[PDB]
RNA sequence: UGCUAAGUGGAAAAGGAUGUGCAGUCGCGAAGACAACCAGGAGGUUGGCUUAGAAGCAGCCACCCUUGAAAGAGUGCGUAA
């Protein structure tokens, strides 16, 4: 990944966000391959699962209003598109976040505003 | 210990160095080591 | 059709794989002239009419054929008994179909054996090939040096070389016996160098597996010292081989290995008497089938004199007599169960060693057969 | 943890399977009892199992499918492939064939459409040098 | 004082070391002069043995009672004590099962119990552990009556002296817990009836070589097992042979030393009358008339030595024909498996039935090894005589 | 004004080497480069052939695809496999 790649990849990840509804910020240290597989399978008719650097998604995150998003890119960073409603892909989450407890979430952004941990948690259960 | 005029990394653990003015080889394996003379 | 010649296992293995539809007959003729010619004809006669006997017996349609195959076959008894070639022990592989027939001639010697089967009975020619291993033989002298193989009871000669740093100064240049003498030994010493050097090639190439030196009562050590680390293990030493005609030269070169092989089967025999008890070597026939079935068998060791027998299965695997797997089952018996081991372990790529003697004294309890698992 | 391929309803014999089996201590012949009832309609191809075995010398087994390269082999009928592959080649085999094999396999690949399973089985038959049309 | 064996068997983790603790701690303070203490990770920490290449850990302590010397064995785990009480150097008399009231017994105690019917043990007690941990009366009721019904279908002593003991108070210093290991003590005391004496049972001598001097005649000797022999007492030669040969002694050599009596351990020299060196071959026994009888058929529970012990590395079948080795000969014999069984591998211990090929003397309880190819590749007891 | 640390100066070759000084090209890097620490390092599959066995790792031929942040038909050690 040099300078080319670099300006591909920051590409990516602007266009993310503008086409999704929602996104939820995550941390995966400790996740096995076939552990992801549970997850996205899971999340598959809802929500999409990525990782990106945390400096390079900054950039990125300049090209769309969530300016007020920067302070949750530090550590590992794993970021949820949703594309379909909310609770479907927050129910998946928050299942999956309990039993391995090697998930952790950081935050959210729903209706143009920054959100926390603790509100999205009351997302799954609206 | 090998004492030979030639002395290189065999493996890639091998490490060359220099002590006393002699140009040394050190490993984690012993048959590795070797010294200059 | 077909008289063979540089036999070795991978020939024989080879040959082992040639099969007939009807069956193949092997003959093994002791034409040692010690013993009384006319004695072993008639046995050998007498044995393939014994067999012409027991195949008629039966009756059947198939045995019926057969046996009229054997008897369409009888000629070529004499064919072995007036052999191609003036060798002490004759071998010849008949096949009651085709026309052909294999035959092989050595110097060493063989007993008298007639056996029908599917394919050749390939068993007595592995101890032969086994008693009879390839060796050099290297006689030196102050006047030149004489190199020579041995293989199967035969010498063959090689070459020949002359003292090349060798002259007469003729008392031109104030000579004296000191200088003579010093100079003759500096150039014996280096031809020692230069016939060490060709007999070490030629062991290297041909695969020689011992050498027999004879340098005289003088230059003998000399010579054994030369060879190198890799060689300087495998050499004899024998003193009066100079001044021998070919019949005691390859008498007392016979002799010479034969010992030497009769010393290296002894410590073979001690080593797995030592190492069992550890759980590296598998003793007794049941193991033995059971480590050649699984393929564990790096060393093979069995007594050719001890009759085994044992059971076959379906699959082709081999059982000792009454212990059968549980899954398997339709359990034919085989009463020349010798074969099929050696057969088996030449399928697996393991190493033969028939020792002749071996269920006498140290693995009598194993009843002579032992092998070296590989894990 | 043991994994090995057995044949369909074969697993009695030993020498292939019994020593592997035998070396964690379990019992070779109540494993092929339980092994052939479970895999005896699928006669002719070769099955592996995941083997585990507990700390009180108790088994359990997990079936899965047929490998990708032994069916690409009966697909076309010829008994080994190629010792030189993209030099020499045995066989062809259709994609419709291919996407056969894909289809059976589907619970055992990453694919989650037919389309990119489909590409996974052809990348098999170039290894054994099977043309693909 | 006679010296006596004992041992703990039980499921592991049930405080064996920790009974085993308590006993030495409360017998040393009782007799500081006497008994001294064992430390537990002595206990804990078995040293290895390869006696024969059989791979065992055990620990040994030892303490004298006021009324014997008792002799106490631990191992660590299953695997050693199914070794050691099949193998058996030394065989214990009594033992006593720590059965710990948590949970009772677990297959293991089954199997325990199994073993020891099977090698011929003749007594068994009990003592429940943990009875500080265990509150309610149920329990430890239900826990009596469970280990009461399996000690008796075993065909064990049905009045066992049952004891309920707390090992980790009493031996922590807990006085309350005390009182409960010397009862242990105690019973122990009055329980494991003492063994008979090897020269109080009937002459046995195993005939070693039968060495022929001038002027006396043949000379039949080996270390005599147990009993003890007299001159003008008729014996009997009983063995391999078919037929069994009644004789008298007629003198009694020990050292070049002509003696009248021989007891147990003596190095003797029986000197027969009206016998020949054809009519006795090493192998068969001398025997006080009638006590034992030849067999040819019995049962046995044997185990199989491993690979890495060097024994076999594959398994054998019915019909396997090793050699069985006895007293000082070995015969051959075919072996059948029982059913629901067709193949024993390296390393398990299992019931077999034996039918030789030449008569030899046995009885319940003898001890004999597998030969195969001239090596150990197993052993065991003798269990019943089919015939 | 600089260089040498070898008493080189005040003997010697093929060749071996993180000694040191000067000059000149190029890669990577505040989009985080190099070193180190935490976590992934997968599935088809034990790729095909050969071999008693050959499963990334005697040997020969190819070296694809997928989920992906990335993960080589595999860089070493190891096992008979
Ligand atoms: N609650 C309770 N625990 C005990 C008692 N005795 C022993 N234990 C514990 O249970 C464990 C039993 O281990 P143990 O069976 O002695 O080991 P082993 O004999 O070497 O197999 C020990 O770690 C003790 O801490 C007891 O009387 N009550």
Redesign the interface.
């Given at each position: 990944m040099a300078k080319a790649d670099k300006a591909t990849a920051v590409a990516d990840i602007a266009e993310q966000f503008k086409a999704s509804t929602a996104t939820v910020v995550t941390e995966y240290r400790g996740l096995t391959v076939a552990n992801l597989a549970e997850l996205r399978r899971a999340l598959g008719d809802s929500a999409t699962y990525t990782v990106a650097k945390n400096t390079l998604v900054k950039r990125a995150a300049s090209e769309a209003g969530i300016e007020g998003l920067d302070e949750l890119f530090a550590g590992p960073t794993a970021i949820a598109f949703v594309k379909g409603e909310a609770v479907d892909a927050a129910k998946a989450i928050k299942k999956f976040a309990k039993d391995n407890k090697a998930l952790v979430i950081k935050g959210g952004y729903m209706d143009g505003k920054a959100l926390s941990v603790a509100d999205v948690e009351k997302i799954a259960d609206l | 210990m090998k004492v030979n005029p030639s002395v290189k990394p065999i493996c890639d653990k091998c490490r060359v160095i220099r002590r006393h003015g002699r140009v040394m080889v050190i490993c984690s394996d012993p048959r590795h080591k070797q010294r200059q003379g | 059709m077909d008289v063979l010649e540089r036999l070795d296992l991978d020939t024989v293995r080879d040959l082992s794989q040639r099969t007939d539809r009807l069956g193949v007959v092997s003959l093994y003729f002791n034409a040692d002239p010690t013993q009384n010619l006319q004695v072993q004809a008639i046995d050998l006669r007498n044995r393939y009419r014994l067999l012409q006997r027991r195949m008629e017996a039966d009756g059947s349609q198939r045995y019926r054929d057969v046996a009229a195959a054997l008897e369409r076959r009888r000629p070529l008894i004499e064919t072995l008994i007036t052999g191609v070639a003036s060798g002490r022990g004759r071998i010849m592989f008949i096949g009651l179909d085709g026309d052909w027939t294999v035959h092989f001639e050595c110097m060493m010697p063989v007993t008298n054996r007639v056996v029908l089967d599917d394919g050749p009975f390939i068993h007595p020619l592995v101890e032969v090939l086994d008693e009879g291993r390839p060796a050099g033989v290297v006689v030196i002298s102050a006047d030149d040096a004489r190199l020579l193989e041995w293989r199967l009871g035969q010498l063959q000669e090689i070459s020949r070389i002359a003292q090349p740093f060798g002259q007469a100064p003729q008392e031109r240049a104030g000579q004296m016996r000191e200088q003579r003498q010093a100079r003759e030994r500096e150039g014996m010493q280096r031809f020692l160098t230069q016939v060490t050097a060709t007999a070490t090639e030629l062991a290297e190439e041909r695969g020689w597996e011992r050498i027999v030196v004879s340098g005289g009562q003088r230059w003998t050590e000399p010579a054994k010292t030369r060879f190198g680390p890799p060689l300087r293990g495998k050499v004899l030493v024998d003193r009066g081989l100079g001044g021998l005609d070919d019949a005691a030269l390859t008498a007392a070169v016979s002799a010479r290995l034969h010992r030497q092989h009769k010393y290296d089967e002894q410590q073979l025999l001690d080593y797995l008497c030592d190492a069992?008890?550890?759980?590296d070597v598998?003793?007794?026939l049941?193991?033995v089938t059971?480590?050649l079935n699984?393929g564990?068998v790096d060393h093979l060791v069995y007594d050719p004199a001890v009759r085994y027998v044992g059971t076959v299965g379906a699959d082709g695997s081999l059982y000792?007599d009454?212990?059968?797997?549980?899954h398997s089952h339709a359990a034919t018996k085989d009463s020349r169960f010798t074969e099929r081991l050696v057969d088996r372990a030449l399928a697996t790529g393991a190493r033969i060693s028939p020792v002749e003697g071996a269920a006498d004294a140290v693995?009598?309890?194993?009843a002579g057969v032992?092998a070296v698992?590989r894990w | 943890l043991i994994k090995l391929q057995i044949q369909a309803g074969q697993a009695n014999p030993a020498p292939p399977v019994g020593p592997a089996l035998?070396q964690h201590?379990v019992?070779?012949?109540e494993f092929c009892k339980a092994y052939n009832a479970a895999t005896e309609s699928q006669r002719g191809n070769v099955i592996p199992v995941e083997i585990t075995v507990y700390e009180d010398r108790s088994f359990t087994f997990a079936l899965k499918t047929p490998p990708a390269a032994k069916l690409l082999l009966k697909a076309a009928g010829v008994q080994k492939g190629s010792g030189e592959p993209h030099k020499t080649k045995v066989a062809k085999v259709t994609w419709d064939q291919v996407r056969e094999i894909a289809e059976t396999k589907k619970a055992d690949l990453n694919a989650n459409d037919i389309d990119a399973a489909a590409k996974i089985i052809a990348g098999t038959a170039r290894s054994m040098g099977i043309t693909v049309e | 004082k006679p010296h006596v064996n004992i041992g703990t068997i039980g499921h592991v983790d049930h405080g064996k070391t920790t009974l085993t603790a308590a006993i030495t701690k409360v017998l040393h303070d009782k007799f500081p002069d006497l008994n001294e203490s064992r430390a537990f990770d002595q206990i804990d920490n078995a040293p290895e043995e390869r006696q024969r290449?059989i791979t065992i850990n055990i620990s040994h302590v030892e303490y004298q009672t006021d009324k014997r010397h008792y002799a106490h064995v631990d191992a660590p785990g299953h695997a050693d004590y199914i070794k050691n009480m099949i193998t058996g150097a030394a065989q214990m008399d009594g033992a006593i099962l720590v059965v710990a009231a948590t949970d009772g017994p677990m297959p293991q105690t089954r199997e325990h119990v199994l073993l020891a019917r099977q090698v011929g043990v003749p007594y068994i007690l009990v003592a429940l552990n943990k009875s500080d941990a265990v509150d309610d009366e149920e329990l430890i009721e239900l826990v009596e009556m469970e280990v009461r019904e399996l000690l008796a279908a075993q065909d064990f002593d049905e009045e066992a002296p049952v004891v309920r003991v707390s090992a980790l108070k009493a031996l922590e210093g807990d006085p309350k817990w005390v009182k409960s290991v010397e009862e242990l003590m105690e019973a122990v005391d009055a329980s494991i009836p003492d063994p008979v004496r090897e020269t109080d049972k009937p002459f046995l001598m195993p005939v070693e070589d039968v060495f022929t001097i001038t002027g006396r005649g043949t000379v039949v000797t080996g270390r005599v097992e147990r009993g003890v022999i007299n001159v003008n007492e008729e014996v009997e030669i009983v063995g391999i042979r078919p037929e069994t040969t009644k004789t008298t002694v007629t003198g009694v050599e020990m050292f070049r030393k002509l003696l009248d009596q021989g007891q147990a351990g003596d190095n003797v020299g029986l000197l027969l009358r009206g016998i020949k060196r054809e009519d006795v071959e090493r192998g068969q026994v001398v025997v006080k008339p009638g006590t034992t009888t030849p067999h040819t058929e019995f049962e046995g529970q044997v185990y199989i030595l491993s690979?890495?012990?060097?024994?076999?590395?594959?398994?054998?079948?019915?019909?396997?024909?090793p050699?069985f080795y006895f007293r000082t000969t070995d015969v051959t014999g075919?072996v059948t498996l029982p059913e629901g069984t067709?193949?024993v591998?390296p390393?398990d211990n299992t019931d077999i039935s034996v039918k030789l090929i030449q008569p030899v003397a046995m009885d319940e309880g003898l001890r004999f090894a597998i030969?195969?190819?001239?090596?150990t590749v197993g052993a065991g007891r003798v269990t019943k005589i089919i015939k």
């Open positions: - | - | 069992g008890g550890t759980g598998a003793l007794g049941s193991e059971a480590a699984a564990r000792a009454g212990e059968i797997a549980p693995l009598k309890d194993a032992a698992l | 035998g201590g019992n070779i012949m | 290449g690979k890495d012990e060097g024994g076999r590395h594959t398994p054998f079948f019915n019909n396997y024909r050699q075919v067709e193949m591998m390393g030969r195969e190819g001239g090596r």
